[PDB]
Write a protein that binds this ligand. Structure first.
Ligand SMILES: *[C@@H]1O[C@H](CO)[C@@H](O[C@@H]2O[C@H](CO)[C@@H](O[C@@H]3O[C@H](CO)[C@@H](O)[C@H](O)[C@@H]3O)[C@H](O)[C@H]2NC(C)=O)[C@H](O)[C@H]1NC(C)=O
Lengths: 237, 214, 207
């Protein structure tokens, strides 16, 4: 009678569950719904895009929570205009470490890499941005955020100061802060094999239907563009 | 008008160091990566160094690995190239060019075709710069540049009022280590009494300009 | 590292002719190749980007092709305005490399050189130096022989020449002969003339 799904996206070849979860390029596809989904990975491991400091956050259990939801679909449209966020003009950070069928460049769709234009050189002030609820009638807002941090000189090469950056988000009573890490980054893991002195810290926040999402950030943030709209409950096993 | 103007040419003795500059105008300078390309006069093309729109990804050729360094400022619409410990082979003409792709790649793969080149400036790698001696000449006439040193030099005519029917000869290499070239123009017979023709010469490293009448 | 090798290096073809230049890469490259036109003395300009995509603003007669290991360049109909040296350029991984370049020149004219002879200026003689110029302007062959003769004496090694090139207006190579001399040797002989393989002559101090 009923059917099952172990792979969150069939027809997404060579893509693990966390590959399609982060919105890795060449892993986006139709993610259908089945009331009885099977759990397979104790350690959801990625493969491809920019290396991740997985242990810094609770990011590893995004699909195992998403698999408990019946219907799943990524955001049809962007959540916020990244370039028009406060704190100066921003350039959509593309990258060659996350390739694409047309060109070797690309990046996550769930998150965009914000880079301040070279007009930026000033003592900064903390910033804030809300996160709307674009999702449908009952589908919960599963927003995926993060920030980038590189070596000491590369941060100063990209941003105004070599000093660490401060971030924090809050939604549905869950409030968490984050400070960036500089230098002596751990080994490259779950990447495409290309050397990168920078690292990525990924996390997510849940907004019940109508609940606004708050995001306070500094330089080096990975603002979300696409987000997950999931509702109901799917049987986990 | 989209322009790319190189600057800082002249003479340097072996082992020295230089800081070349390039000025951009007429386009959104911040979106396109930049390249530097050298060329020995009358020879092939060799690539120097390339940088993305950001200062995040720098790539150098192995021929100038550790000796040259690229740098840019998008707030001032200027591109720089820092050169250290210049070798004898580095004597060439160096071009400033922008990339055509606007991809803000920040990764290894960001370089593409140029589509826009500057006029270039000459890098010479060790004797005092000399100023030229200028000598004048249907009928024909011209002007001789003699007794000078640096190859970069141009000749204008009537303050630039005649390029048709003219022919500019490349520099010759005398056994005296000094360059030499001339430029002549085809004129009718009756032009000897009606129009006064003037040839205009300029030498940049020695700040020498001489305009002579026949 | 990548290296590019272009095939003909020197191409001679008639007006309105279809010419073909190939550029094969040392290693494999997928469509990442561009082409450039460079007339002598001026800055190069791009013609074809990313394997056969014609650049906006350039004539439609140009065209490219190629994929994988072998890449092709094509000029459908030749206009005299197309004379230049052409380079293929890759934008795949590592330093972008060019071919060693291919030069192109045209193969339809026979027009006879115009000959002009110029006595040196008086103001140059006041500095202890004299230099005579022998000119041959707008001649097709380029393959030409010019000799000097000062009073039936052969001038050897003391003359120099220049590569005038051909301006792209149905024109052809020119040439000037620079005979370098000193002041002492100048006033010791009378007749000056340069042989062409026809000769114009003058006398030192006459009208
Ligand atoms: C990943 O591959 C997809 C195709 O499966 C790319 O799709 C489209 O690519 C263009 C070119 O980068 C994107 O930008 C647009 O380009 C046009 C032409 O230059 C420009 O006029 C527009 O203003 C826009 O910048 C386009 O947004 C994109 N569309 C979609 C739905 O993806 C995609 O670009 C590739 N990924 C990345 C990061 O480029």
């Amino acid at each position: 009678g009923t059917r099952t799904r172990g792979k969150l996206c069939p027809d997404c070849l060579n893509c693990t569950d966390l590959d399609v979860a982060l919105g890795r390029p060449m892993c986006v596809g139709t993610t259908p719904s089945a009331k009885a989904s099977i759990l397979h990975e104790v350690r959801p491991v990625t493969s491809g895009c920019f290396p991740i400091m997985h242990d810094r956050t609770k990011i590893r259990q995004l699909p195992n929570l998403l698999r408990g939801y019946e219907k799943i679909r990524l955001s049809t449209q962007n959540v916020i205009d990244a370039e028009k966020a406060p704190g100066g003009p921003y350039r959509l950070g593309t990258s060659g470490s996350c390739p694409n069928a047309t060109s070797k460049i690309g990046f996550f769709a769930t998150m965009a890499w914000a880079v301040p234009k070279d007009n930026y050189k000033n003592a900064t002030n903390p910033l804030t941005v809300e996160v709307p609820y674009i999702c449908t009638e009952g589908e919960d807002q599963i927003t995926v955020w993060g920030f980038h941090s590189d070596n000491k000189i590369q941060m100063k090469s990209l941003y105004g100061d070599s000093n660490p950056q401060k971030f924090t988000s809050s939604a549905n009573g869950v409030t968490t802060h984050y400070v960036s890490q500089i230098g002596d980054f751990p080994d490259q893991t779950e990447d495409g094999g290309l050397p990168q002195s920078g690292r990525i810290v990924v996390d997510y926040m849940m907004q019940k239907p109508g609940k606004t999402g708050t995001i306070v950030y500094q330089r080096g943030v990975l603002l979300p563009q696409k987000v997950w709209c999931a509702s109901g409950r799917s049987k986990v096993i | 008008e989209v322009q790319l103007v190189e600057s800082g040419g002249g003479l340097v003795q072996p082992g020295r160091s230089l800081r070349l500059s390039c000025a951009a105008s007429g386009f959104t300078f911040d979106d396109y990566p930049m390249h530097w390309v050298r060329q020995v006069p009358g020879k092939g093309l060799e690539w120097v160094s390339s940088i993305n729109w950001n200062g995040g990804s720098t790539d150098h050729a192995d021929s100038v690995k550790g000796r040259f360094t690229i740098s840019r400022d998008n707030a001032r619409n200027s591109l720089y190239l820092e050169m250290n410990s210049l070798k004898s082979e580095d004597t060439a003409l160096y071009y400033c060019a922008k990339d055509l792709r606007a991809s803000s790649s920040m990764d290894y793969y960001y370089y593409s075709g140029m589509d826009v080149w500057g006029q270039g400036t000459m890098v010479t790698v060790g004797a005092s710069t000399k100023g030229p001696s200028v000598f004048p000449l249907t009928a024909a006439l011209g002007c001789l540049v003699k007794d000078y040193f640096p190859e970069p030099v141009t000749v204008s005519w009537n303050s630039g009022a005649l390029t048709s029917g003219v022919h500019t000869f490349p520099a010759v290499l005398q056994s005296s280590g000094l360059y030499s070239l001339s430029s002549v123009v085809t004129v009718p017979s009756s032009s000897l009494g009606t129009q006064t023709y003037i040839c205009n010469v300029n030498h940049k490293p020695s700040n020498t300009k001489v305009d002579k009448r026949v | 590292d990548i290296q590019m090798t272009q095939s003909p290096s020197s191409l001679s073809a008639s007006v309105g002719d279809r010419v073909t230049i190939t550029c094969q890469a040392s290693q494999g490259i997928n469509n990442y190749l561009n082409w450039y036109q460079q007339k002598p003395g001026k800055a190069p300009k791009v013609l074809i980007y990313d394997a056969s995509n014609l650049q906006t603003g350039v004539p439609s007669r140009f065209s490219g092709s190629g994929s994988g290991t072998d890449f092709i360049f094509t000029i459908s109909s030749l206009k005299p305005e197309d004379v230049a040296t052409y380079y293929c350029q890759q934008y795949e991984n590592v330093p972008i490399t060019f071919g060693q370049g291919t030069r192109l020149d045209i193969k339809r004219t026979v027009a006879a050189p115009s000959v002009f002879i110029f006595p040196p200026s008086d103001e140059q003689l006041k500095s202890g130096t004299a230099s005579v110029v022998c000119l041959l302007n707008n001649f097709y062959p380029r393959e030409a022989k010019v000799q000097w003769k000062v009073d039936n004496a052969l001038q050897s090694g003391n003359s120099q020449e220049s590569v005038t090139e051909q301006d792209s207006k149905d024109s052809t190579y020119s040439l000037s002969s620079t005979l370098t001399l000193s002041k002492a040797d100048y006033e010791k002989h009378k007749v000056y003339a340069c042989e062409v393989t026809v000769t114009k002559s003058f006398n030192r101090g006459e009208c």
